[model samples]
Target: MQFEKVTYIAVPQKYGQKKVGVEEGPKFLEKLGFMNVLEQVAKSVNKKTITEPKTPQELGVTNARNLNEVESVNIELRDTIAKEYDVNNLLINIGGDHSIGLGTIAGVVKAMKPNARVGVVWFDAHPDMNTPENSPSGNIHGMPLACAVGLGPQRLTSIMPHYITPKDIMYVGIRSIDVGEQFEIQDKHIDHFTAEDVKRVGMKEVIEAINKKFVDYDVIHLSFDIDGIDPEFILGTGTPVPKGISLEDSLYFMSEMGKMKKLHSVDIVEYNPKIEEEITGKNVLKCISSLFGI
Candidate 1:
């Protein structure tokens, strides 16, 4: 299939505190080759794109609810992205955090074909399945997965130009989950490949089993939180936990998955540079760059 130019848009949501850190990630990525790669990838895809479209100096959440600042620009962002898609391209959301994934993907709802397949692979140390009522941290970052499935406030979902089913989503690399989030995942029967699954069957087998079921999807949206890597692989993330997937195993999964040609969009989230070591950042970028099949 022909490639599409990678359009780099920075929605940079700075709501709920971590936004500043998360937004800065794209800059770091640029420093580490985001723009250069973006241009190079566009050459491969045959179309050039932009990296602009700024949001407010943060979403001004003081005038709204806790996560509303994020949701506000996110609501508009979805429409903008969908319209951009129609014009010519695919989107690569350099995440400020996992919470932005909810709005970013919501923007692509229209492209999900009827009888079209859209699968999600949520790679994070935590399931991030919490709702407003259940999170221990009470942070929207933890609740991003829930919001994606229409479990959150209407201000967000109502803006969706199309539908994204909860069943189509699969969670991988999860070790931490709240009781409330656990109930939500189970209540919806969402496909989850736990951290234990990695220890038992391995990443290849785990992804294989999942792809067998979701092989029909037109696009695969995978949101990966860097903290999904073992703490030894990364430091500086506030939510880092022990015993996760090795970077070796993680890259293998992405390399194989890229060949499937179904990975339409991806987000790399939850990287706090203050806590992350330089080597860890380099390693993650190497894994991410492989997605371009370069």
Candidate 2:
């Protein structure tokens, strides 16, 4: 989407060889013509780009998503997006990874009060509900949902000045949570619609139900990880998983997201230009730009 201010914050420590290169996600997206897509969507919209603080790091990472870098940038992204929203403008973040959603979620949730209605729709193959104690691999990106819900390292959970109840969110498209995380998921009783349910009930019905359930919230934020798309559909993603949401259904969800006036912020992550695809990257960007403003 075209915006008055578009911030691109890079962390050298966060940009490792593999998935963390997804940290360079926004740049590749730009190279693939991200600005052109926005221009076509709204020529009158003003455009500005800003990059934020980047931290230095140590040893390289190779897990599905970089735990440390993901956690840090998220804390940073949360504040920048929240402050941009304060001015009644849109905040479009092309992330280093999906884990950044935690920061954006925390900062936005903190900016509003208990009375401020905020609903979240987390779209991903993995539930990302892990606590360091629960995750066998210990990738922090997998735990962003949990972090936003106030159940992770104090560094992340405390990133925002305040916290919001987990019940305010309605997570969707989850199919890959670890075994230990199952206990945490059930214990927390987070509201999530599984891939099985979404496939059977259909994306339209699922989105409608969530809309009704969290209607009390003033804003709805989406944490969309490209890995949420079926590995077949979005082949370029770093954490490609089998049997994820189709690109078509993703557009359906995005269209529905566009219909809602309350949708204010989004963090799209895990896009890698290295995957094989029939149409190059057009399909991925098309799915998002069709309804979600690029």
Candidate 3:
């Protein structure tokens, strides 16, 4: 899609997981000239920040960690995106964690025509599809996709007007799949290209495969987790899996995906500046720049 008027929304959330500094992802990117990058491509850029609950509570102490906070933040995010989606050509949500994916996808679906088909390209080291029952850590970050597809708690799944089918989603750079996620992927027949698959087949083939998979989709949303890139290159995220997609391949993937006319919105998540900021942040910016062909 052409970069015309773009909307940048920052959801500085940390309750999705135990990481403390992930909430600073948006501010960290801003400190690294995120606005400058947007201005370089879009004719006009508007920025919005999702409100965080003043006193976030971890009500779900049994299974879902920080359930109350995660639910509240995501609800606000869903409403905000649904409201602002139509006015902007591109909606870029800089996230606190992958948990924001549930809200982002829900918002996009809510904003689109009732019959429009929205597909998602999930770029991450993990599938983020674990249900509360099966999630070993009980981290909400691992359950966003499941919640989006109506597999998790009703409180989270109810956020979506309608659930997206597994066929409407494609995964990239995923290598660290949990047992539940693996079962879901196979049982649902979800399309995916693991990190090893990408390495063996090449990025060109991976892009071509993605294009072929989502050719009939009306809109595509990209949810990118920084850990999808190899830990050798990206060390600032909470979960850094080894032998992920190379930084070079990731940039190529982003540039190619950016060229797609149906690509509407994007999420860049799981960036914790408290870990190793300078190099990882710069590389993340590079990927963003490559996305807009800068």
Candidate 4:
């Protein structure tokens, strides 16, 4: 969407996984002058921060690691986004992990008209589609998509008014897939372009495919995981897979997506500055800049 205003939400939560530094993602991006970047992109920028649990131990772990914390954070996120989202404003969520995808989607969908079709463009090295029963890591970050689609734990799925079908989602930059995730993709015939597929077909084809797939949807949301970029270019994410999308191609993809009139919201996630700060943080900013055509 050509938004005159922007709503920026910073979620400093790391309870989705075992990692520590990712919780600081939003602040680190700010340290790298994210607010300055926002100033250049929109006429008016409204900023908000989701309150994180004071202690990771506030709610004990359950089916997934830090299950209580993850659920609580997302509930607050859903409420916040549902309140802040506006059709004429760009809603950008800087996340602590991909697990926040559940809240983001739920909140966006809640803010839309009843029965509005919401299409998701997931850019990540992995699908994040594993269920609690099949997740090898027991990390909630790995199960957000599943939860978004009404396939996960009740507490998580109940956050959404209704489940989005596999037909409503498209995947990009996928390379690492778990056995269960592979089955779900194949069984559901989900549209996807792997890292190798992007190399073979080109990003132009990928964007065209995304447009065609979501042509009928009311709005599109982009969930971007920093690890989707090649490890050579980004080493700060908790889970970095090798041989992924190149930095240039990624920027091109972002800029192209930014040009779409139906693209409403975006999530920039999985960035951990504690690993290797400056280079990775700068590259992340470059991607964000391209999204706004800077």
Candidate 5:
């Protein structure tokens, strides 16, 4: 898309999940100079620093775990994006977990104000569509998508109030989902394709089909969970599942999506270098490389 400038928004928040190292994803990727990937595709590159929110003194008064930290981190992220979001620039969000989606997507949606139609393409192993009341694990990471669609905790759903309907979003490489999420997916009629669907129809066609639906939107956001890649290719992400798409497939699709005229923002989530630092670095590089039109 020939972006003039790129802003790297790092959200090293880790409270959404029980893991300790997920918060280090931004630092690890930054050490690798990951934002340089955009240098090859954009006119300029810049990064904004966001301090991790401190842990909440008391547990939240809700079914959600890490409620205070989750809310604080997302609010910080939202504020960062709102202040820096520019239509002439590309935003790359390095997340602590999928929970970051709650802020990244909402910030972009709000920044494009005055009824700008926004669509999201979510690539993940899990649907991430659970609500606090239905989540078995109470992990906020699993509930970001629900919160994005205004179907979760009031605080989360009301953050910036980005109104995105089910049809405005698309899910690719989804295989793991909770029972409550399954019903929610059906009831909302969200468009999605499994890894198997990508295999049979090919990643190009799948991405093309998604683009077709969002052709009229003012902006398109792609939220990628590293766990969407096969564990064999990427083992350093939280919630890795078997039988996921290969690294090549994921990158090729991301590259194609990067070519879309409407795509302006992307989020790379769930990368935990604590597991397999070497291979994880390589995997992260590959994902970052594909995200730009390089």
Candidate 6:
């Protein structure tokens, strides 16, 4: 609650999947004046971009794609975010892919003070729980949730000095899930709601419930993937899923959650500018604006 300004970090690591176009997400968002909008809310706005590392011919990681690049970029990203948080700066990371969450969340946990438990609310079309053992696509982007919850390999789960358990996370707008992910979700007893659940229980009620569930945590981080919104409103994302949440409802949800005194950081990821350029980036800006009261 004593936080001051927002530091926007751009991670353009399309390294998760070949030809995913996610690497261009952050640049497009900056071109769209995403930073300008966020400035309206924060006392000061600072910007930094994480350069994507070149992938070597072969990576040693198993059950994951772009193993070397994923590890490299996320390590840098984790350090960058941790440095920002160490100074008590609010973080808003614009990402190349959902895989970047592995770094952001880890950075948050690393920077938090003692007795400060980290809670996350993940908004995405997929649960992102695919382990290297079960990923149909082998993309690390699909497995960040698993890694953050300490369900994946140590290379990823151990990236953080401390880690958050699946018990502290809540996933919303999950509609597309892989078979491997199904087992993880069940075994971990992960709390989540699909697009159908949003419609059935209502978005406001669902968010209210999540707030109550997370009341025990000292800080809350909301990691949002653009794919959580229907493709009709936000096009050009890495993965498009139909019948997701409405744009209006999505903003309303952000506005409501922004009211939470414990809310600390946010990340918007998996936006591919090559798909729709301006509109996609602007929609991302809209999501950011709602959260920070812009």
- Which lDDT values do the candidates have, in the order given? 0.66, 0.65, 0.90, 0.91, 0.82, 0.82
- Indicate the residue-level lDDT of 10 in model 3: 97
lDDT of candidate 6 over 42-96, digit per residue (tens) = 6687788897776552344455767778888889988988788643456788888
Worst 10 residues of 3 by lDDT: 53-62
The residue-by-residue lDDT of candidate 5 on 41-73, one tens digit each, is 776877876678766533445568877777878
Pick the winner on TM-score between candidates 2 and 4: 4
Better of 1 and 5 by lDDT: 5
Q: What are the per-residue Cα lDDT tens digits for candidate 2 across 1-294?
A: 444543333322233223335555556666777776666545444333334335553334433334455555665566665565542445556665556677778767766775676778888888777777766655566777777767877767777556666677677788887885677668778787777778888998987887787777788877777777777678776666677777788888887886677776667777766554335366667765865554
RMSD of 2: 3.6
lDDT of 3: 0.90
What stretches of model 3 exceed 4 Å from their correct place?
Answer: 56-61
Candidate 2, 106: how far from true, in Å?
Answer: 1.7
- Model 3, position 189: C-alpha lDDT score: 96
Model 5, position 48, has a per-residue lDDT of: 76
* Candidate 6 error regions (>4 Å): 1-3, 56-62, 86-89
User: Over the stretch 195-227, how does candidate 1's per-residue lDDT look in tens digits?
Assistant: 778878888897787678677767777777888
For model 3, how does the per-residue alpha-carbon lDDT over 47-70 read when each residue is reduced to its tens digit? 889987556546454679888888
Cα distance off (Å), candidate 5, residue 276: 1.9
Each candidate structure's TM-score, on Cα atoms with residue i matched to residue i, is 0.85, 0.84, 0.96, 0.97, 0.94, 0.93
- Note the residue pairs that clash in candidate 5: none
lDDT of 4 by residue, 151-229 (tens): 9989999998788899998999999999999999999999999999999999999999998998998999999999999
